[PDB]
């Protein structure tokens, strides 16, 4: 299928408690493969998936240097953000960045990203054209002017079209047993009386990868969006994910209800019922 690679940066100030912590995590799809933490005893890029352990010493040296340089760069960004928002140096703030690329089944670039946030709000983002920016406010516009002058977009584009897709294609090949395997959900419906009058039907999906999934209930063929309790897709700890959908149904009306499951590991969508 299609695939993504993303790096997520978090830079967190903490006045009175040393210098801002800088974290990086890298993902292929929903698989974490690399991490860096400036708070680590000896900060370095560390492998988090078997297939990346293949990369040579030079890869780990270069990757570590990027993150080490980033720790300093992002400390400067935090100081600058404080100025741009007329903020005092007593408070703690956060800069985040997501960047990377999506490829199709043939490995061609689908689209690239380079997005930034400050205190959990949009700051600045490379547009899908990979040649212009969207600034969220007048502060980000200052950054925008700087990056337009420095032709940053052009240089991002070069990375996104080249090394981003080149490395992802190599990673996809090296981790082909896992990154190119979808695990379908294991599914069942449980039945829990809530009173004489109502019972909960819970539709479970367990053991699935990647995390993307759709679980819905219908009553007599109609979607029960408003009356369905749907928990956030959650990690199991074994690479796989879990989700459930619950509906409260009138006593005796259980068979009017069907659960519907969409996931890329299923060749076709499943329809589930309570099986007393």
């Amino acid at each position: 299928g299609s695939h993504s690679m993303r790096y997520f940066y978090t830079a967190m100030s903490r006045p009175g408690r040393g210098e801002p912590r800088f974290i990086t995590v890298g993902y292929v799809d929903d698989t974490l493969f690399v991490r860096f933490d400036s708070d680590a005893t000896s900060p370095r890029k560390e492998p988090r998936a078997p297939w990346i352990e293949q990369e040579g010493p030079e890869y780990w040296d270069r990757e570590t240097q990027i993150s080490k340089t980033n720790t300093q760069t992002y400390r400067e960004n935090l100081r600058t953000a404080l100025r741009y928002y007329n903020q005092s140096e007593a408070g703690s703030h956060i800069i985040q960045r997501m960047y990377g690329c999506d490829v199709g089944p043939d490995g061609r670039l689908l689209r690239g990203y380079d997005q930034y946030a400050y205190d959990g709000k949009d700051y600045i983002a490379l547009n899908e054209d990979l040649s212009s920016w969207t600034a969220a406010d007048t502060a980000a516009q200052i950054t925008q002017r700087k990056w337009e002058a420095a032709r940053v977009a052009e240089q991002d584009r070069a990375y996104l079209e080249g090394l981003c897709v080149e490395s992802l294609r190599r990673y996809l090949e090296n981790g082909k047993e896992t990154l190119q395997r979808a695990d379908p959900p294991k599914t069942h419906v449980t039945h829990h009386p809530i009173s004489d009058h109502e019972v909960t039907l819970r539709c479970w999906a367990l053991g699935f990868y990647p995390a993307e999934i759709t679980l819905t209930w219908q009553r007599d063929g109609e979607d029960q969006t408003q009356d369905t309790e749907l928990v956030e897709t959650r990690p199991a700890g074994d690479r796989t994910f879990q989700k459930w959908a619950a509906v409260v149904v009138p006593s005796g009306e259980e068979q009017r209800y069907t659960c519907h499951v969409q996931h890329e590991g299923l060749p076709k969508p499943l329809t589930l019922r309570w099986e007393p």
Partner: peptide
Amino acid sequence: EEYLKAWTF
């Protein structure tokens, strides 16, 4: 693989 390049805010 990460992008080397870093310009500031």
